[PDB]
Write a structure and sequence with these properties.
The structure is cut from a larger assembly and holds 1 copy of chain A (54 residues), 1 copy of chain B (50 residues), 2 copies of chain C (55 residues), 1 copy of chain D (906 residues) and 1 copy of chain F (141 residues). Chain D has 906 residues and is mainly alpha-helical. Chain F has helices at 9-43, 136-140. Classes of the chains: A mainly alpha (54), B alpha+beta (50), C mainly alpha (55), D mainly alpha (906), F mainly alpha (141). Chains C and D meet through helix 1 of C and helix 38 and helix 40 of D. It is classed as hydrolase. The entry lists the keywords 26S proteasome, AAA+ ATPase, hydrolase.
């Protein structure tokens, strides 16, 4: 099946890479804002938590 | 894991952080309980006969 | 066969190159701090704890 | 299956499924016994064939494989192909399927590797005779439909591909490479490839572009010419022949680097010339960027005909279609020379006729004004520009203009742009000059300058054939020693001719754009104009413009803004060539300074265009390095730095835009999401990089001619309210313009929200106001494309003034330049000998379904709509013709082009 | 944040019903199709005319 | 000595590896591009030479080297001399002999009578390298 078989293996190979890009992004580390104000907001909440306003 | 869990399995939880522990044996199904409380039987064709 | 081949050629270089670009950029983000990106993940868990109570 | 001996012919077939008694035993014993019995084997050859034929109706591996096993051996094991030359030569026809049975029917790595070499070799040797062709044909046209032959014919072809490809990369080549052990191209193997190619062109399509590409020579393409030109009507029909040619050509732009891509497309022009539609020829000729290919079709219709007939009208039409008018100049001159009539021919070729129909189209669309009339402050300046922006194209609004009140209330550089915005009312219209003339002879120099810009804009609709040209008016002004005047003059001249080259335009820009010794920042326009003339066609890579860049840098390093514009102009100049642009890359790189490198990356986008995936990895390493260098640290210099950083960002983008149009339409989609993800990325990394990346995004989108226009701008638009540079909005609207009030309804909403909602600075406000009005045209008066129309994978020339202005910060000074954003796309209508101003009917279909196109030629189904339509933008670009049913036949194919229709009623 | 209350409103679907299972009355099809289906295909006709699409 | 402390190499390393991945994935395009590239280089020069382009690339035959003498308790050793030197490292941790120098005209005492333990040595000429170690007991006594 050579003309179509060889290239079909390559198409699957291309699906693998599209998945890896996905698994990298959401764990090291998904955006909610631009990226930068979601990091600082985590350090901002530490300040609120030490306080008993809540 | 979560690859063992589907919706509507009773689970045991361990009180401390409510960590999921195991699947419990019995499952609840609502359509089973509707004909049990109505309490219709089911019966054979020979019984209808005449 | 060649109809498959022109798509294979565009799709591979553009996508795999992009994949490489992400890998370098997590690291570079790390540098002004000392580990920004891999720590934002540890912070999110920490802040939220377990359990999370629905309201 | 059952063994039932030589009783009848049906039970011979069953016999040989297990073990033949007239193929293996006999022939083997016979060959290995006496040597007069090779003559008896030759008679038995006929026998071997009939039996093969009967069992090529089976598909089970076991019973053809095992059966025929020892013949495949006998070749090397006992005969050793040396007992004689012709006698082993001509008996390879039963042994070749026997070989195929371990290659293809079974698959086993140890045997498949080893016998692969053996199949190649005997394919080559046995094709001199040409008996190898006939075995191949018996499977391609089949005997029965079962799965087997569908893979068996596939392997035989794949042999040839294997070897040829391996001879080009390796420095070893020939038959001493060990890929298939078989000769390079030979001398009597050459003829074998030609014979295979015919049969496979008839029945298949697969290997036909492929064969060409493996050789990598235009010669393979010229061999193709010969066969295809016979075939054009008796083997399959003409329409079909066309869809094949272009599939090869567009597809294989990714597989072709520059000196090769131009040479392949020469041939594709010749196929079209051999065939009847000289209209398909012209499409390709524009594509080359050659003056020569266009002249030949024009000479082909004009010269052999000693009458008007269809033939002269058909020539004029073909040359009219570019909206640059790169074709308008070339086709003119032979009309003047032949002389059966001047009056019809000259108007019809030129953009003189496109004016008459524009008025007719305007009548459907009407004129609806919705502009604000805010007076005083920078708010004054905003409202005076917006009126011109709302009435792009021929529109009319004379009386408001005639009152000099709102004119005299403009001030500054603002005043200049106000007179200039008036010219865009009279875009593609001769008349207007009267309004313009008034300002030119009275008041401050400011109103005088703005008149010349406005003349530029207006004059673009009538200039070809040098009949009352912009050149006539604008020369006096150039001579004049004041800088503001002359800069204005030579800008309007660049616009007016657009992509048309001529002796007069060129020669005006030749003793200027070469004095940059004394400091100014408005002699940007100097080179900018010369760059504009060149685009859309062949280049000389002119020394005037390269020289003046050098001199500018030597004289001053204060005016980083001047040199930033100058840099971008070089890159626009070179647009329209790429092979020569390599020669001059070295010249620019000769003098080295970190300052010089900022220009280098820009010029890189054109040089590398068409071998543009070498261009992608470079423009990306270039980006990462800033962040990396910074890293180390974390854990006059000013002018170089600022220029340095912004250029890389422009160049990267520039690279993508030129590449994506020419190469695949498929990647265009990917490029829309990627760009936004790119902006966020830069925003983190380099502080300086962020302002530039915002603004570039709008022209990335317009240049490429994206299909998805609703979703992505709108998501980003909200984000860019917060972000710096409110000039970001102007650039977003340039893409959105499309068919107006499809895309542009959400654009208005989105931009008008941000502007009313927060006023954080009236500077910030001005940009936001311009954008909302810019984006619309009342009920799709005229769409804008950077695309030509005539090709969707070619590139504009009118739109290159829009492109310039996204690399720098906003200023009232900038405002004067943005008034121009010329380029119009005519709606198609059916023309007769009295130039009728309506169409009958057209089909529109958002995108063609077909896969056997990649350039476009619609399906016939479509969606029917009535008379007098504007040709919709992307998301409706394919426009097809309906007339066939009323017994009427088009002469001029449309595919989704700009081109006008001409019809024959019977 | 999905509800089963919304799913009651929604359908899961691939009808057996297609136009031209309508045995005649062709004109009536091309008054309904002019009303329901057509402004999704083209909003272009209705803005070009300047009418508000029929509800 | 051996030290495992570094931490500035990370930045130079991060682009260096970025290039190694990028070129592999780019490779598909680059085969076709290289076909034209070659015929100029063959004509002119390889980079700026005519030498070491007569092979497959610049080598043919075994490209690697390795030598081992560690992670073995005996495999190789052969004969190795040692002499006593001032202002030089010398370890009686490595070896089990250690020989005395004859730069000195004096000689060490009698060589090995063999065996192991606390063993009395005996020989008939003192003229062989042996050496002396000094004793804390003599100092006390």
């Amino acid at each position: 099946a050579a003309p179509y078989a060889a290239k079909l293996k390559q198409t699957e190979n291309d699906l693998k890479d599209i998945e890896a890009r996905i698994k990298e992004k959401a764990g090291v580390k998904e955006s909610d804002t631009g990226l930068a104000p979601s990091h600082l907001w985590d350090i901002m909440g530490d300040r609120q938590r030490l306080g008993e306003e809540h | 894991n979560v690859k063992d869990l589907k919706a509507s399995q009773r689970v045991c939880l361990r009180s401390d952080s409510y960590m999921l522990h195991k699947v419990l044996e019995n499952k609840a199904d609502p359509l089973v309980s509707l004909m049990m409380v109505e309490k219709v039987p089911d019966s054979t064709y020979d019984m209808v006969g005449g | 066969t060649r109809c498959k081949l022109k798509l294979l050629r565009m799709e591979r270089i553009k996508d795999h190159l992009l994949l490489e670009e992400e890998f370098v950029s997590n690291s570079e983000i790390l540098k002004p701090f000392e580990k920004k990106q891999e720590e934002e993940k540890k912070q999110l868990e920490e802040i939220r704890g377990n359990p999370l109570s629905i309201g | 299956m059952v063994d039932e001996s030589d009783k009848k012919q049906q039970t011979i077939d069953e016999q040989s499924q297990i073990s033949p008694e007239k193929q293996t035993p006999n022939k083997k014993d016979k060959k290995k016994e006496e040597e007069e019995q090779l003559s008896e084997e030759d008679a038995k050859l006929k026998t071997d064939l009939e039996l093969l034929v009967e069992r090529l109706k089976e598909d089970d591996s076991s019973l053809y494989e095992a059966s025929l096993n020892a013949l495949k051996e006998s070749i090397k094991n006992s005969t050793s192909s040396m007992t004689a030359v012709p006698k082993p030569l001509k008996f390879l026809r039963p042994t070749y399927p026997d070989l195929c049975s371990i290659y293809d029917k079974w698959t086993d790595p140890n045997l498949k590797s080893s016998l692969a070499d053996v199949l190649s070799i005997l394919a080559m040797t046995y094709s001199e005779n040409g008996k190898h062709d006939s075995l191949r044909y018996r499977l391609l046209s089949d005997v029965s439909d079962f799965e087997g032959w569908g893979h068996e014919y596939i392997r035989h072809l794949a042999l040839e591909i294997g070897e040829v490809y391996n001879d080009q990369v390796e420095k070893d080549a020939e038959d001493e490479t060990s890929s298939d052990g078989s000769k390079s191209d030979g001398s009597a193997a050459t003829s074998g490839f030609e014979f295979s190619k015919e049969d496979t062109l008839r029945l298949c399509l697969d290997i036909v572009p492929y064969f060409l590409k493996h050789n990598g020579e235009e010669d393979a393409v010229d061999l193709l010419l010969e066969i295809e030109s016979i075939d054009k009507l008796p083997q399959f029909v003409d329409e079909n022949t066309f869809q094949r040619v272009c599939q090869y050509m567009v597809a294989c732009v990714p597989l072709l680097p520059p000196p090769e891509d131009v040479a392949f497309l020469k041939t594709a022009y010749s196929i079209y010339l051999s065939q009847n539609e000289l209209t398909d020829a012209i499409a390709l000729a524009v594509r080359l960027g050659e003056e020569d290919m266009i002249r030949s079709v024009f000479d082909a219709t004009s010269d052999p005909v000693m009458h008007k007939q269809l033939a002269y009208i058909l020539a004029a039409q073909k040359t009219s279609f570019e909206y640059e008018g790169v074709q308008d100049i070339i086709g003119n001159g032979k009309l003047s020379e032949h002389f059966l009539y001047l009056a019809k021919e000259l108007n019809l070729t030129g953009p003189k006729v496109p004016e008459d129909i524009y008025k007719s189209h305007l009548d459907n669309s009407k004129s609806v004004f919705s502009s604000a009339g805010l007076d005083s402050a920078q708010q004054n300046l905003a409202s005076s520009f917006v009126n011109g922006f709302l009435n792009l194209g021929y529109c009319n609004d004379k009386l408001i203009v005639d009152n000099d009140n709102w004119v005299y209330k403009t001030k500054g550089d603002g005043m200049t742009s106000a007179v200039a915005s008036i010219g865009s009312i009279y875009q593609w219209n001769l008349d207007g000059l009267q309004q313009l003339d008034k300002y030119l002879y009275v008041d401050e120099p400011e109103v005088k300058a703005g008149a010349l810009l406005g003349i530029g804009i207006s004059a673009s609709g009538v200039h070809d054939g040098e009949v009352e040209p912009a050149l006539l008016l604008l020369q006096d002004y150039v001579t004049n020693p004041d800088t503001k005047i002359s800069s204005a003059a030579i800008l309007g001249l660049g616009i007016a001719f657009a992509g048309s080259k001529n002796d007069e335009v060129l020669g005006l820009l030749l003793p200027i754009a070469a004095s940059t010794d004394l400091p100014i920042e408005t002699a940007a326009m100097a080179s900018l104009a010369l760059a504009h003339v060149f685009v859309g066609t062949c280049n000389g890579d002119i020394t005037t413009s390269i020289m003046d860049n050098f001199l500018e840098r030597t004289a001053i390093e204060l005016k980083t803004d001047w040199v930033r514009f100058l840099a971008l102009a070089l890159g626009i100049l070179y647009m329209g060539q790429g092979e020569q642009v390599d020669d001059v890359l070295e010249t620019i790189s000769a003098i080295e300074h970190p300052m010089t490198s900022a220009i280098e990356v820009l010029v890189g986008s054109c040089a590398y265009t068409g071998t543009g995936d070498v261009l992608l990895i470079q423009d990306l390493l270039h980006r990462l390095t800033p962040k990396n260098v910074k890293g180390e640290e974390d854990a006059e210099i000013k002018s170089e730095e600022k220029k340095g950083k912004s250029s890389d960002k422009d160049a990267t983008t520039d690279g993508k835009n030129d590449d994506e149009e020419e190469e695949k339409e498929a990647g265009i989609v990917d490029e829309l999401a990627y760009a936004v993800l790119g902006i966020a990325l830069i925003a983190l990394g380099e502080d300086i990089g962020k302002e530039m990346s915002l603004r570039h995004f709008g022209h990335l989108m317009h240049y490429g001619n994206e299909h998805i226009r609703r979703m992505v701008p709108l998501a980003m638009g909200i984000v860019s309210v917060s972000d710096p540079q409110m000039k970001v909005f102007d650039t977003l609207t340039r893409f959105s313009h499309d068919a107006d009030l499809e895309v542009s309804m959400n654009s208005i909403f989105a931009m008008g929200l941000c502007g009313a909602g927060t006023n954080n600075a009236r500077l910030a406000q001005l940009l936001r106001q311009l954008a909302s009005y810019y984006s619309r045209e009342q009920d799709a008066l005229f769409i804008t494309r950077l695309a030509q129309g005539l090709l969707h994978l070619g590139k504009g020339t009118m739109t290159m003034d829009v492109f310039n202005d996204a690399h720098v910060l906003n200023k009232v000074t900038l405002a004067s330049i943005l008034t121009t954003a010329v380029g119009l796309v005519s709606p198609s209508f059916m023309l007769k000998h009295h130039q009728l101003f309506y169409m009958l009917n057209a089909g529109i279909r958002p995108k063609f379904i077909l896969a056997l196109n990649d350039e476009g030629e619609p399906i016939k189904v479509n969606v029917r709509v009535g008379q007098a339509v504007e040709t919709v933008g992307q998301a409706g670009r394919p426009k097809k013709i309906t007339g066939w049913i009323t017994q009427s036949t088009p002469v001029l194919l449309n595919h989704g082009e700009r081109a006008e229709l001409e019809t024959d009623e019977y | 944040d999905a509800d089963p209350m919304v799913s009651v409103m929604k359908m899961d679907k691939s009808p057996t019903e297609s136009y031209s299972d309508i045995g005649g009355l062709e004109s009536q099809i091309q008054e309904i199709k002019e009303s329901v289906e057509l402004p999704l295909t083209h909003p272009e006709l209705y803005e070009e005319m300047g009418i508000k699409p029929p509800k | 000595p051996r030290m495992y402390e570094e931490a500035s190499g990370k930045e130079v390393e991060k682009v260096a590896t970025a290039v190694l991945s990028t070129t592999a994935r780019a490779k598909a395009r680059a085969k076709k591009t290289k076909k034209e590239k070659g015929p100029n280089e063959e004509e002119k020069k390889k980079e700026h030479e005519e030498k070491e382009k007569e092979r497959e690339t610049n080598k043919k035959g075994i490209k690697e080297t390795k030598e081992n003498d560690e992670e073995f308790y005996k495999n190789k050793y052969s004969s190795k001399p040692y002499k006593v030197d001032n202002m030089t490292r010398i370890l009686p941790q490595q070896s089990r002999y250690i020989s005395f120098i004859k730069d000195d005209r004096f000689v060490p005492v009698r060589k090995f009578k063999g065996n192991n333990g606390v063993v009395v040595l005996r020989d008939r000429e003192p003229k062989e390298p042996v050496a002396l170690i000094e004793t804390v007991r003599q100092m006390k006594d």
